[PDB]
Amino acid sequence: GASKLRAVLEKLKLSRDDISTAAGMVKGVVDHLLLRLKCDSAFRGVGLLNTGSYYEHVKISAPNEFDVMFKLEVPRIQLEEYSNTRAYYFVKFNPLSQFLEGEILSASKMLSKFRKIIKEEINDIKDTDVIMKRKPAVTLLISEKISVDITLALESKSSWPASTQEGLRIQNWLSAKVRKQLRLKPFYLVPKHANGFQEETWRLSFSHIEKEILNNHGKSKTCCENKEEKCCRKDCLKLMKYLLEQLKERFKDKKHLDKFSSYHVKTAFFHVCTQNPQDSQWDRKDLGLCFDNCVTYFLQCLRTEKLENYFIPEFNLFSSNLIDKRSKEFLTKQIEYERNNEFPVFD
Ligand SMILES: C[C@@H](CO)NC(=O)c1cnn2c(O)cc(-c3ccccc3)nc12
Numbered sequence: 001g002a003s004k005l006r007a008v009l010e011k012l013k014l015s016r017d018d019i020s021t022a023a024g025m026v027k028g029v030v031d032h033l034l035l036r037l038k039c040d041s042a043f044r045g046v047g048l049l050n051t052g053s054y055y056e057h058v059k060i061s062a063p064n065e066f067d068v069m070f071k072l073e074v075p076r077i078q079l080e081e082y083s084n085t086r087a088y089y090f091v092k093f094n095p096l097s098q099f100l101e102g103e104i105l106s107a108s109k110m111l112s113k114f115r116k117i118i119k120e121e122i123n124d125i126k127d128t129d130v131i132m133k134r135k136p137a138v139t140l141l142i143s144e145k146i147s148v149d150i151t152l153a154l155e156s157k158s159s160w161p162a163s164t165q166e167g168l169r170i171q172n173w174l175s176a177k178v179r180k181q182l183r184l185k186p187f188y189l190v191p192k193h194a195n196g197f198q199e200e201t202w203r204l205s206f207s208h209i210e211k212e213i214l215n216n217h218g219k220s221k222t223c224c225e226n227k228e229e230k231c232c233r234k235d236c237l238k239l240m241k242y243l244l245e246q247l248k249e250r251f252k253d254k255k256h257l258d259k260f261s262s263y264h265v266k267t268a269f270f271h272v273c274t275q276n277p278q279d280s281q282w283d284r285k286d287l288g289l290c291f292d293n294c295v296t297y298f299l300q301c302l303r304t305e306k307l308e309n310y311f312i313p314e315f316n317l318f319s320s321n322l323i324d325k326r327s328k329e330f331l332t333k334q335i336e337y338e339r340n341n342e343f344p345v346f347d
């Protein structure tokens with residue numbers, strides 16, 4: 001039974017043109033900010049990253065909400081793992097000399113200059129109306145409709161940290177050949193401090209690898225290139241993403257589902273892909289069964305309080321220290337009700 005599922009997907013597809021026009025306004029403002037950012041010595045090598053839901057063709061439900069990534073190549077860096085977290089690091093070693101708070105690169109001083117240049121540049125541009133929202137680093141508001149979340153990410157062309165060594169288990173699905181090729185690619189560090197936090201740490205980012213894997217997702221190279229080879233991987237992720245967005249909208253005034261994000265859904269999705277490496281396990285005709293495995297796996301993670309980062313196996317996104325048991329039990333209660341009642345939150 002995939003009828004309501006196929007119905008949702010068609011409706012979601014109709015929002016494509018609206019998302020495309022809105023992206024036009026954003027491309028204008030962003031190209032301008034990058035031209036002005038490149039002027040400062042520190043942000044000279046700044047560029048547009050091209051990762052996210054939109055570039056992975058999985059952008060569901062919000063044309064008035066865009067997330068943009070700004071990469072900045074950093075030359076010869078040394079990482080120091082913070083408090084055995086496996087995901088959070090200190091950036092040690094130059095254009096960024098001004099932001100060194102000891103031998104360590106300050107996330108706060110770095111982001112303040114970034115926010116400062118952006119604040120200075122949005123007043124100077126009169127072509128379109130752009131406002132900057134108060135202290136996903138910098139948030140803009142274009143023409144009073146479009147919100148743009150701007151993230152700064154350091155780029156390192158070094159070997160991936162030791163914590164990733166046993167991650168990205170795509171060998172039996174996408175091949176070891178591909179895994180080797182992917183790990184040769186750079187890695188990113190976004191400033192994330194996650195009583196009181198360490199406001200000088202950087203978290204690992206592999207948004208570019210997630211895009212590569214999603215846009216070349218089959219065991220067969222010709223997956224989704226012909227009628228006989230069409231799969232439902234992307235559709236299951238779109239449906240999982242929409243399921244959480246809809247439930248998070250339904251209970252916005254409650255505050256339980258606040259700690260859950262589309263990243264939890266996407267992570268759980270990649271785990272299901274590792275479990276089901278065959279394209280035959282993802283047949284378009286089996287969408288109902290495939291979406292049910294995704295729902296089922298996600299619920300097992302919520303019950304067992306275990307959702308490991310796809311790249312950092314030792315990092316548990318569903319740890320009791322991150323998300324309290326009552327919140328996971330609320331999300332379980334809601335998802336189970338939905339599955340039992342042919343997904344009323346969809347229509
Ligand atoms: C669930 C929240 C808060 O943990 N995260 C996100 O929403 C989130 C969105 N992209 N992304 C990502 O590219 C990487 C990570 C990540 C999380 C934990 C450990 C290492 C990396 N998270 C994200």
Ligand SMILES: [Zn+2]
Pocket residue numbers: 217218223224229230231232233
């Ligand atoms: Zn496919």
